[PDB]
Design a protein around this ligand. Structure first.
Ligand SMILES: NC(=O)C1=CN([C@@H]2O[C@H](COP(=O)(O)OP(=O)(O)OC[C@H]3O[C@@H](n4cnc5c(N)ncnc54)[C@H](OP(=O)(O)O)[C@@H]3O)[C@@H](O)[C@H]2O)C=CC1
Ligand SMILES: CC1(C)N=C(N)N=C(N)N1OCCCOc1cc(Cl)c(Cl)cc1Cl
Length: 218
């Protein structure tokens, strides 16, 4: 069976696993926004600037793409891989209000009529193996779930999770991660590799957050 491209998950969720209200993210944590940008944009080695020749790819569901404000659509300096059963590349670009930016964005957007697995099969192509350094799954609910299920979970390299507290009173969409010291029936157990001390966001509500990195146990 054609092998799947390895990948990492980047997500922000509260203790109840909440990640959103169905349409957007309920909290304002600029520190996470900035960290997310750096983590998904940065290329390894010294002074390697992202370009179509080599850059990371961010895989997201169509609803997550729609959730991106104009200033973040597409996510610059990264290949935007959008999963949709109906929306084509042109249709995804059609929603970008600035016509010149929309023209410039054509080079950074690819539509996949399939789920995460389909995206990973595609990112394994010799073209992408060279031009795409790291693949980051960035949501939302439907995509995160596929990430922790076979066969995708078998090539999951790490989870960069921003833990948010206190729990949101607006979350209806979740990301179910197995608790520490627990192994899912499917066979996945995560181990903390690192975690920052809790900090208070300068954002509205002053949410308390931590940047945690988890990896599958082997
Ligand atoms: N806290 C966090 O870190 C993050 C939170 N979010 C939030 O989560 C919510 C969105 O999550 P969610 O509702 O799950 O939507 P998703 O972002 O997961 O997108 C789901 C959509 O993607 C496409 N899709 C999913 N699986 C397949 C498949 N197998 N084949 C083809 N297309 C597929 C389909 O779009 P189509 O309808 O076009 O067919 C589907 O409706 C929002 O509240 C958002 O703000 C999003 C990212 C990160
Ligand atoms: C949650 C966020 C950023 N943080 C971490 N750690 N991990 C993620 N996967 N993230 O979401 C990526 C896709 C949605 O991005 C946005 C959504 C909104 Cl609503 C706005 Cl205003 C700006 C951006 Cl870039």
């Amino acid at each position: 069976r054609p092998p799947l491209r390895p990948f990492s998950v980047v997500v922000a969720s509260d203790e109840k696993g909440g990640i959103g209200d169905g349409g957007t993210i309920p909290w304002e944590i600029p520190e996470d926004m900035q960290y997310f940008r750096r983590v998904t944009t940065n290329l390894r080695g010294k002074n390697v600037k992202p370009s179509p020749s080599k850059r990371n790819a961010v895989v997201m569901g169509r609803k997550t793409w729609d959730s991106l404000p104009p200033k973040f659509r597409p996510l610059s300096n990264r290949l935007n891989v959008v999963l949709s059963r109906s929306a084509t590349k042109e249709q995804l670009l059609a929603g970008i209000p600035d016509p010149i930016k929309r023209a410039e964005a054509a080079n950074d957007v690819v539509a996949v009529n399939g789920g995460l697995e389909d995206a990973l099969r595609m990112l394994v192509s010799k073209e992408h193996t060279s031009s795409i350094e790291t693949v980051f799954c960035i949501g939302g609910g439907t995509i995160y779930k596929q990430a922790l299920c076979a066969p995708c979970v078998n090539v999951l390299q790490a989870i960069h999770r921003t833990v948010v507290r206190p729990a949101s009173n607006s979350c209806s969409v979740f990301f179910d991660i197995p608790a520490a010291g627990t192994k899912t029936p499917e066979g996945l157990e995560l181990v903390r590799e690192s975690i920052t001390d809790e900090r208070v966001s300068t954002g509205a509500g002053g949410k308390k957050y931590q940047f945690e990195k988890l990896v599958p146990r082997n």
